[model samples]
Target: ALRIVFAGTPEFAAEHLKALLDTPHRIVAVYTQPDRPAGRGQKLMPSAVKSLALEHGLPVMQPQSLRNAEAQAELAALRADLMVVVAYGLILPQAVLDIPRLGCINSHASLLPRWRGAAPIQRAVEAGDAESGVTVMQMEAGLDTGPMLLKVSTPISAADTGGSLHDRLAALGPKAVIEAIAGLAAGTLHGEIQDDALATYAHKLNKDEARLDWSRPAVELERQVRAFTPWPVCHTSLADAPLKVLGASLGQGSGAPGTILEASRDGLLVACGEGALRLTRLQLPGGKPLAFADLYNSRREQFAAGQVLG
Candidate 1:
C-alpha cells in the first residue's frame, strides 16, 4: 500500500479520491480548491473533493496557490509516496512536484496527445471525435502534455451530449487510477511519450461559445446543442429573451437561415446555413426545458412560420 496525497476539486476529482480511498493506498491528505460562492443563494460551498474528504475525517487543505514556499513546505511535510491529481484547478510548481517519492500522477479526461487541456470530454464530442478516453499520466510541470501511463477508451456516439460524456468519463476514471496505482506499487508502471506535435488544446467552454448562431451550418449547430448541454447550454434569442436549446437534431426542412420553417407537435424546425435544425427540447427565459410539443402548446404564436430566430 502506498501513502497517497490526493489532490482535486470537482465531482470528477471526488470520484478519483474515492477510488484511491478504496484501494490499498493510504490517503494521508487531500488538497482541493477552496470553497466558493455557488447556486442562487451565493453561499460558499465546499468542493466535491473537500466534502468527501471531510466525511472520511481526513485532513483537507484548501490553498489559493501552491507556488509559495510555505504551501510547498506543507506538502513536502506529508512525505507522500504518491500524489494523485484529477481536475485539480491549481497549478503545481516544479518544486512541489519534487516532494512525493513516487512523483505525481493525473487522471486526465482525454487520450493523451489529443484533447490535452481543459474541457477535454466536451471538446471531444464538440469536435466529433470518434473515440475519447481517460489517460493516467505521470504529471510534469507542463499542462496535460505528459507521458501516458494508462488509457481507457469510450466511443463518442451520435446521441452523446457533454453531460453524458462527462458522466461516462467520470465512471471510467476510478478503474484507470486504481490499475495505474497497482502498477506503480509493483514498480511496473510505464509511460508512453505523448506526441507533442499531435496535441490539441481544448480551450475552455463558456456561454459565448455555447450559444447557437443560426448563421452556421445546421449540423454544426446541432452538435453544439449536444456538446454544451447542462452548462451554458446552446442558446439563442426568442423575441429578444434568452432561450436555451437543450436538444436538437438535423432536419430536412430548410429556408432562409434562422427562419422558422415549421413548428408543430413534431418540433420547432428552423433553417440554417446549410440545412435545418429541429429543436425538440427547449427552455424559455426563467423556465424549465420542455418538449417542443409541450412548450408549443403554451406559446403557439411565438413560433409562427417565417419568423426568424436569432
Candidate 2:
C-alpha cells in the first residue's frame, strides 16, 4: 500500500477522496484550499474534501498556496509515495510536485486535449457534445496537459444538462483513479502524451456569460439554460423585470428573437434567431422555480404574442 497525500476540493473531488479512504493506501495527509465565505449569510464554509477528510479522521491542511518553500517543505515531510490531486484549486509548484516518490496524478473531468480547463462538464453540455467523460492523468506543470492513464466515457443525452453530466463524471472518477493506482503498483502503468495541437480550453463559467441572449438561436439558448443551472442560471427580462429560465425545449415556430409567439399549459413558445423555445419552467427573483403552466395561470396577460422581451 502506498503512503499517499490527497489534494482536492468540491463534491466531485470529495467523491474520489471518499473512495481513497476505503482503499488500503495510507493517506498520511490531505490538502485542500482554505475555506471561503459562502451562502447568503457569508459564513466561512469548508470544502467538500475537508469535510470528508474530517469524517475519516485524516490529517488535513488548508493552505493558501503550495508555491511557498514552507508549504513545499511541509508537503515533503509527509513522505508520500504518490500525490493524488483533483480540482485542488491551488497550483502545485514544480518543487512541491517533486516531493512525492512517483509524482502527482489528477482525476480530470474531461477527455484530455479537449476541455482542458476548469468548466469541462458545463462546456461539453453547452457545446452540444455527444459524449463527455473523465480522465485519470499523470499530472505535470501544464494545465491538464497530462499523460493519459485511463479514461471512462458516457454519452450526453439530448435532455442532459451540466448538473447531470457533473454527477455522471463524478461517479466515474473514483473507479478510474483506483484502477490507475493499481496499474502504478504493478509497474504496468503507461503515460500517453497529449496532442498539443488538438487541445481546447474550457474556461471557467461566469455570471455575466450566463445572461440569456435572445438574439442567439433558441437551440443554443436552451443549451445555455441547461449549462448554467444550479450556479449562475440563465436569465432574461420582460418589461425590465428579470425572469429566470429553468427548463425549456425547442420547436419550429419563428418571429423576432425575443417575441412571445405563444404561451400555454405546455410551455412558453418564444421566438429565437432560428426557431422557438418552449420554456417549461421559470422563476422570479426571491421565489422558487415554477412550471410554466403554473406561471401562466398567475401571469397570463404578460405573455401575449408580439410582446418583445428585453
Candidate 3:
C-alpha cells in the first residue's frame, strides 16, 4: 500500500479526501490551515478537511507555516511516498517538495495553463467561459505551473453559477486524483510540461467588485450576478438600504442604466446598457432572501418605477 500525506482545506478539498478514505492507500497524516473566524458569530471554525480528518482518527497538523525547520522535520519523519495537495493555500518550498518519494501532486480546479491561481471557479463563471475542469499535476516551485499528469473536463452551462459549478467539480475531482495516484504507483504516469504562453492567473475575488455595474451589457451583468452569487453577492442600494440580488434573467428593454423599467410579480425589471434585467430573487439588509413577487407584495412602494439603482 502507498503511504500518502494529504494537504488541503475547504469543502472542495475535503470531498477528495473522503473518497480516498476507503482506498488501499495509507494516509499517514493530514495537513490543513489553522482555524479561522467565520459566520455571523465570528467564532473560530475548523476547515472542512480538518474536521473530517479528526472524525476518521487521522493525525492532523495545522502548521502555521511550512517554512519552519521544525515543521519540515516533523513532516519528513512521516516518510510519505507522496503528498497530495488540493487548495491548501500555502507555498511548499523545494525542500518540502523533495521529501516525498514520488514528489507532490496537486489537484487544481481549472484546466492547466489557464485560470492558474486562486478563484479559478469564480473566475471562469465571471468571464463566461463555456467550459472548465480539473487538472492533476506534479507540483513545482512555481504557482500552479507544474507539469500535467492527467485531466478531466466538464461543461459550464449557461445557467450554472459559481456555487453550482463548485459542487460539480467537487464530485469530479476525486476520481481524477485517484486515477493519477494509481498511475504513479504503477510507474506509468508521465507528465506534460505546460505552455507558459497560455497561462492566465485567477486573482482572488474582491467584495468591492460585487457592486453592480449597470453600464455594462445585460449579458455581462447577468454573468456577474451568477458568478458572485452566495458570497459578496452582486448588490445595489435603494433608500439607504443594501439590496442583494440572488437570481436574475435578461429582458428586452432600454433606458438610462439602472432605471427601474417595471416591477411585477415576476421581478423588478431594470434597464441596462443594451437590454434589461429581471431580478427574480433578492434580499434587503437584515432580511431573508425572498422571491421578487413576495417582496413586492408589501414593499412595492420602495421599488416603484422611476427609482434608480446604481
Per-residue lDDT tens digits for candidate 2, residues 173-265, read 999999899899889999988999988899998757877888899889988888877767788899899989889888769898989998898
Candidate achieving higher lDDT, 1 or 3: 3
Across 229-299, the per-residue lDDT of candidate 3 in tens digits comes to 77668998877678899999988899999999999998999999889999999988889999999998988
Clash totals for all candidate models: 0, 0, 0
CA lDDT, candidate 3, residue 287: 91
Ranking by lDDT: 3, 2, 1
- Model 1, range 1-310, lDDT digits (tens) per residue? 9899999999999988887777777899999988998867868999999999999999999989999988998998998999999999999888877999988999999987899888897788888889998999998889887789999999989999888988999999989999999999899989999888899999897657776788889888888888887776888886788888888998987678899998989899999998899999998877887999997898899799988877
lDDT of 1: 0.89
Which structure among the candidates has the greatest TM-score?
Answer: 2
Better of 1 and 2 by TM-score: 2
Rank by TM-score, highest first. Answer: 2, 1, 3
RMSD values, in order shown: 1.4, 1.3, 1.6
Once superposed on the true structure, which residue ranges of model 3 sit more than 4 Å away at CA?
38-43
